[model samples]
Target chain A: ALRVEGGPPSLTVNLGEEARLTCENNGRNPNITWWFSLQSNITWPPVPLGPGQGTTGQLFFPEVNKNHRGLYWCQVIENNILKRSCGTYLRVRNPVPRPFLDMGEGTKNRIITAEGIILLFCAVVPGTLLLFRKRWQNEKFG
Target chain B: PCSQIWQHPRFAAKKRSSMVKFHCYTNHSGALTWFRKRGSQQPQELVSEEGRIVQTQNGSVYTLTIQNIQYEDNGIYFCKQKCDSANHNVTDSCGTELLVLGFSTLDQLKRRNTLKDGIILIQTLLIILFIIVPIFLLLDKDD
Candidate 1:
């Protein structure tokens, strides 16, 4: 009579980006409140959203960070009881570029040029690798 | 009129047979027995022989296969375990009311796919109607 539904068993996001969690309901009974569970804990935290209608619920994480990475669960509550959705994992990553290290002379001009080149090289190489890998994975799995 | 026994059908489908697995929990020494009832008649034994049930430390589980299940196999199935002596009619362990429906189990699989498609459509519609449309209107009106 009561159920929770969704896909995307896990999700990944950058530190400064947003993450979204969505679910759907199956039962005919309307739910009044929606809650989220973190890290497999059974306790549900009420998520502030628009008025309840169907079972569908969504959670938006703004400016995600490492602390936001964990298992998340959604639930539909009616008549003081709740039916929980299956657990999903939310992963967040750091997006800040690393500091550049230069082994050249400590003179102001030399140091600035060497560090700038190193930083550029580091950002370009990894950024290119990341873009290609992401594209490859999407093509393979999508 | 004799009491009519009503039994729920137990076949999985017209072409495929089905099996029902049962679990029993009791701290006793009784041998487990399985019974099936059809229509309005008395329940008939499906697994009544001794040593036919699986033994466990806390309880025992028995899997009874209704081979080549037909319409007649419909009805409630019962699993009972008696620890007392065979001569003594003492009910030591009991489990009952497992209804096996003969309808197509594959129907559930098909329904699952439909559910997925429906979710996708609903999400798309919601995004368009609530997020995209509102933002579009706001941008145009602001200008």
Candidate 2:
């Protein structure tokens, strides 16, 4: 029996970060291969690693992207018998910040106060001008 | 029981320019071979020929991609693993049926066009009758 171990139940990494997938076998066989599946499709072939003589090895991604996010596992073929390791789900997320408005609390309050003052001035000035012109006309006609 | 391989038995309405893919999974590991048997004839091994049959293997999973699928390409496809040198023994494998259909005929195309034109004509007549006739009647009533 061959038992393979890949690290962690789940891993969340930002974009452009390095991801390392390790596969270790407990059985006597040291011959191992690695592959990955993405969205129910096998996206990679079994790649031989470690000179075919190591019980523990790793599949490394120097920089992980959205394409690298998937389930990966290792296989050990010994004497015509194939043993597969448990799949590890590698999730890659975009680290780029979304578009947002970041107006400070102080700036927002200041803008509201300025707008209120302008509106009050406009209303009062228009009403006062109209009243004064009416009074002047009445005084002249009388 | 022998290890089983799975595939789609029917592929419908495939064009000549389109490609078809067959996926097979097995428990053994060796050189994955693909064979095609049409009707009651003997099975012939498929070879990679440019835009023809292309095979790929990833561990126990194998994929056969047939480019420019033609009518002659319709057959039952088998995915088998060659025996290891030490074992030197072969076993029966599972297969999938692939049917590469032809394109629409000129007569069928003409019939489809005729049906579409009939629908458009009926829609236009209905719109004129329901909307334009009602507006004209309303205007006449006012006059």
Candidate 3:
């Protein structure tokens, strides 16, 4: 069996859909296998798959529903010992909801009005100063 | 490849306006070549610092310059120092990924408005302290 490194154990699938999980093996002349286990069901360990070395074996579900979510494992047999990745969580959900926000409410309007007034007053003062400065410069040098 | 702290290679980048600097700390110093490599070929020497290299601005730091930069000056660079007669560690080179971005003229009216806020704040404070206080003082004297 091949040695599989850096992979998650189980994968989650949504209800009324399909799920796919992959196992990667990265070693020379290594054998790879995969199995699945569902709790509170008669399926303890599913039949082992092939022993493809230095490649990935995929476990797929056609039309997966709420009952197909459970712990799946990829067993790599190297040097007479079993090395498995961490078990992954499979969460199933239906059509998800969307979130939104409404921003044009009361308190926001008052603050915006105050800021606009302050900005307008500041803009007028600058123009009056520039006019007075230009008149002074003309009388002094021009 | 054998791994050691002397064999560790690194790459650096800086702005195009400044001088390019490279640094390395190793026990042996006589067999290194500072070079630039472009595209897919091996490195060629930009300068050889086998001797007369001095520490500048900080310890173990060396500076080099290329005058009058142009558009074609961007590529991979390397600082390769020989470990022995046959083995060497080629460091990633120091260079800029030169890209020309967009430019636009700033709004002069809006710039004047932003500066005017500070003058407005000072005028408001002076009015409160000098004008309003003196009027109150004169009213108190009349009473």
Candidate 4:
């Protein structure tokens, strides 16, 4: 039995991103064939791409979209028979908009500022003490 | 395992349901694969058939693209080469951190606010206990 090995059991992709489908054989299959059928219409027979790139088969996609969601497999034709490969599922996902939090920079800034002010008030007290005591000490009290 | 591999785009970010790609550069003679690590757990191998497209040995770049990005997709990705034992354990790329923006970032701000709330409360108490009260008592004593 001819077998092809490479890649994961399944694949998931987002719209607008590239998806890779690979099929490399060691039947010692020379060259390869790749076929694809969209999940939307699984009833139809897979159209043979009839294109094989040596022992390596790659269904390369530059920008994958929802239409590309389907099952992809590879075949090696020889010995008057066709050898099928491990099928990969090409699944697509879309970006979902989520609630965005508005971090009131105002609140953060004010809180941070208030932290500083509290420290500053404590220092103002010390500064007042220093000035008043400077005068008192100079009055020559033992 | 090995660090000999090189992954490009040290980091990446994508919105939920978007796409992202990572590249790995390595010398010939090894099977290349991609793996992702989330938190402290082991790096999970990503299934995507990839290897040198061409028969070049000097060097080559392999790619792994994740489509339909989701919130759970946040993690560091790396590339590894599996080859002969003599070649030693195939090292992987340094790793790339992917940021799942969207819902995840909002949670980040939520935690930030919570932490800020605690810090400010402590800061206010620090002034009252360590500065204001002590100052008041000291002022009367000194006078």
DockQ of all candidate complexes: 0.01, 0.01, 0.01, 0.05
Candidate 1 chain B: 10-residue stretch with minimal lDDT: B1-10
Q: Tens digit of lDDT per residue, candidate 3, span B1-143?
A: 21111211122223443344434444344444566645547657664333323333233333444433333445444345545435454323222222221122334534444444445455466545544544454454333
> Candidate 3, what DockQ?
0.01
Local accuracy of candidate 3 as per-residue lDDT tens digits, A1-142: 3334434422445576777666666755455676655432364556454443345666666677676555555676666767655333354745323211112224334534554575566556656655766676677676
Clashing pairs in 3: A1-A30, A1-A31, A2-A30, A2-A31, A10-A88, A12-A90, B77-B93
Task: Identify the leading candidate in terms of DockQ.
Answer: 4
TM-score of chain A of 1: 0.47
The full ranking of all candidates by TM-score, starting with the best, is 4, 2, 3, 1
TM-score of chain B of each: 0.40, 0.59, 0.38, 0.56
lDDT of 1 by residue, B41-137 (tens): 8867764333433333432334444444455655455555654544565442211223343343535634544544455455446444544444454
Sorted into a CAPRI-style docking class, model 3 comes out as: incorrect
Model 4 Cα lDDT, one tens digit per residue, B78-117? 6667756775654445455666644544457557667676
True contacts kept of each: 0.00, 0.00, 0.00, 0.07
Worst 10 residues of 4 chain A by lDDT: A95-104
Total clashes, candidate 2?
0
lDDT of 3 at B12: 21
The sequence of per-residue lDDT tens digits that candidate 4 reaches over residues A4-104 is 45344346778777776777556554656777654333578887765744446666677887766555667677677665553556766464333232246
Report the candidate with higher DockQ, 2 versus 3: 2
